[PDB]
Amino acid sequence: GIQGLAKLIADVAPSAIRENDIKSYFGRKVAIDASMSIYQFLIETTSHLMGMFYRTIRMMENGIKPVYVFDGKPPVKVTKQHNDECKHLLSLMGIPYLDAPSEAEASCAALVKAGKVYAAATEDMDCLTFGSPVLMRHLTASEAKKLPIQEFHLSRILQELGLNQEQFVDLCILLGSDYCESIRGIGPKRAVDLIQKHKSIEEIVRRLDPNKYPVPENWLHKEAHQLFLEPEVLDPESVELKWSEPNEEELIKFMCGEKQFSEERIRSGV
Ligand SMILES: Cc1ccc2ccc([C@H](C)Oc3cn4c(c(O)c3=O)C(=O)N3CCOC[C@@H]3C4)cc2n1
Ligand SMILES: [Mg+2]
Ligand SMILES: [Mg+2]
């Protein structure tokens, strides 16, 4: 995640965010961060299946064509069983899924950048740092929250901030990422100003007062910078997204027979 990034974009580049009704995404393909979704559904339980079933029905009823992306090896805990059960449900629902080689959000970004889908759906702001042109938030949110879809357009973030993607990555590192430490005492607005002036963490560090703003020791900022700009992602040319007919009888055998959900409920959803 990126600490304070959504708040910063709302304060300093508000035209990069649009709040939209779910009906406005008719006909669009979306790459869902399935790993972040199942985690949210979990926050033997069946809420990973309840969430995946109902939020997927919601997307399809609004004309959205979702593809679910699952995490691979890393560069409340979601288990192999949760992922396997969700994939089994997705297959019987006729919804496509992809296994990312590493972070799902980086591979959802790759699908958007390649033009395979319109947007990446995740609450994780790392998706923008990994370079997704469009990020949609609150797509899988409970109807109890009645949240609009919060869409971020990365090009307008870069445009309002007067930055390229390399500089934006260094800004996110200074904001506080999960790949390395940030510099203590430099807040979000000061980090924007420093990057706009000096462009890189390298040019900032050679200027900071070591008495005032020392940098972390064994700082992995170069490795973090490289992972965001060149992430390990799925090859979008190997992807052909297809959606098929849900298998109602098998969905009943799995959700009702094996997982004890209501038959009338599952049948009405199918
Ligand atoms: C509830 C909630 C809503 C939004 C949130 C945004 C960001 C974050 C933190 C700071 O960052 C991340 C957390 N996670 C993941 C990320 O990539 C990540 O960057 C992730 O992939 N998974 C895999 C499945 O297991 C859970 C993890 C969750 C936590 C959040 N928590
Ligand atoms: Mg992340
Ligand atoms: Mg993730």
Q: What is the resolution of this structure in A?
A: 1.7
What is the rounded distance in angstroms from the CA atom of residue 268 to the CA atom of residue 83? 24
CATH number of the domain located at residue range(s) 5-158 in this protein: 3.40.50.1010
Residues of the chain with CATH 3.40.50.1010: 5-158
What is the rounded distance in angstroms from the CA atom of residue 83 to the CA atom of residue 90? 10
> Does 33 count as an annotated binding residue?
yes
Phi and psi at 122, nearest 5°, equal: -165, 150
For tokens 């805990």, the residue is 77
What is the rounded distance in angstroms from the CA atom of residue 122 to the CA atom of residue 137? 6
What CATH number does domain 159-229 carry, 3.30.420.10, 1.10.150.20, 3.40.1260.10, 2.130.10.10?
1.10.150.20
Residues of the chain with CATH 1.10.150.20: 159-229
Q: In what order do the strands lie in the sheet with 29-33?
A: 17-20, 149-153, 134-137, 119-121, 29-33, 65-70, 97-99
Tell me the CA–centroid distance for residue 145 and ligand 3, in Å.
22
- Ranges assigned E (strand) in 58-112: 65-70, 97-99
Tell me the CA–centroid distance for residue 127 and ligand 3, in Å.
8
> Ligand 1 within 6 A of 40 CB?
yes
